[PDB]
């Protein structure tokens, strides 16, 4: 891919974060805390899962950003509708307004319903996410493997403004404390 030149500066939106998350001062890193982070509840916060949105909203154009996933056992990445459900239980699917991939239990899968197996030869330490709003495309690239394609969602029904989406995952094992980090352009 040659998508890096639609690079956008993504920052995290504190107000949308699950109350156990810790967002860095520069709003470029997020990790799971070992407790509630002493914030008030609000209607934006994801209640059930360790999720947070980017501050940026997109309704047109081409956008590209990169995320560091080094040393993590579990995470979800992609984009979602601004109008996604925040409270209670839900699945990550295009029907629910999410275009995502994840790592879980040593397998990589795309967030279709049902989920789709990914074939990645080089486990990624950094993921590139490309959105073409007009084309209806969300694509994922393996930065560790020369930018190789991971997965493409096409004919997407965005149905409104889009936000960058992140899930740092639980840390029941003690092996998933590492942060997600937005990488420099």
**Chain residues that interact with ligand UWS, rule: CB under 6 A:** 18, 20, 49-50
Of residues 21 and 69, the one with the C-beta less far from ligand UWS: 21
CB-count burial class (<10 Å; 0-12, 13-18, 19+) for 14: middle
Of residues 88 and 114, the one with the C-beta less far from ligand UWS: 88
Of residues 59 and 170, the one with the C-beta less far from ligand UWS: 170
Of residues 50 and 111, the one with the C-beta less far from ligand UWS: 50
Least distance to ligand UWS from the beta carbon of 106, Å? 22
For 166, the token pair is: 């992140």
Cβ atoms of 180 and 29 closer than 8 Å:
yes
Least distance to ligand UWS from the beta carbon of 20, Å? 5
| DSSP-derived secondary structure for 20-33 | TEEE-TTSSEEEE-
Of residues 49 and 90, the one with the C-beta less far from ligand UWS: 49
Least distance to ligand UWS from the beta carbon of 89, Å? 12
CA distance 15 to 61: 26
Least distance to ligand UWS from the beta carbon of 163, Å? 19
For 110, the token pair is: 């795309």
Instruction: Identify the helix (H) or strand (E) that includes residue 170.
Output: none
Q: Quick one: residue 32, left, alpha or beta (phi over 0 = left, psi -120 to 50 = alpha)?
A: beta
Least distance to ligand UWS from the beta carbon of 21, Å? 8
For 62, the token pair is: 């081409």
For 30, the token pair is: 């997020």
């Amino acid at each position: 891919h040659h998508h890096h030149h639609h690079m956008v500066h993504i920052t995290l939106d504190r107000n949308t974060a699950n109350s156990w998350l810790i967002i860095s001062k520069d709003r470029r890193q997020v990790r799971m805390g070992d407790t509630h982070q002493n914030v008030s509840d609000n209607k934006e916060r994801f209640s059930n899962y360790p999720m947070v949105l980017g501050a940026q909203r997109f309704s047109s154009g081409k956008m590209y950003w990169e995320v560091d996933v080094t040393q993590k056992e579990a995470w979800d990445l992609g984009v979602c509708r601004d109008s996604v459900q925040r409270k209670g239980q839900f699945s990550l699917s295009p029907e629910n307004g999410f275009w995502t991939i994840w790592l879980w239990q040593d397998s990589y899968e795309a967030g279709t319903s049902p989920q789709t197996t990914l074939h990645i030869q080089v486990p990624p330490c950094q993921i590139g996410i490309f959105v073409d709003y007009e084309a209806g495309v969300v694509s994922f690239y393996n930065i560790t493997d020369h930018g190789s394609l991971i997965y493409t969602f096409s004919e997407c029904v965005f149905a409104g403004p889009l936000r960058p989406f992140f899930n740092v995952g639980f840390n029941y094992s003690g092996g998933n404390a590492a942060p997600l980090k937005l990488c420099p352009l």
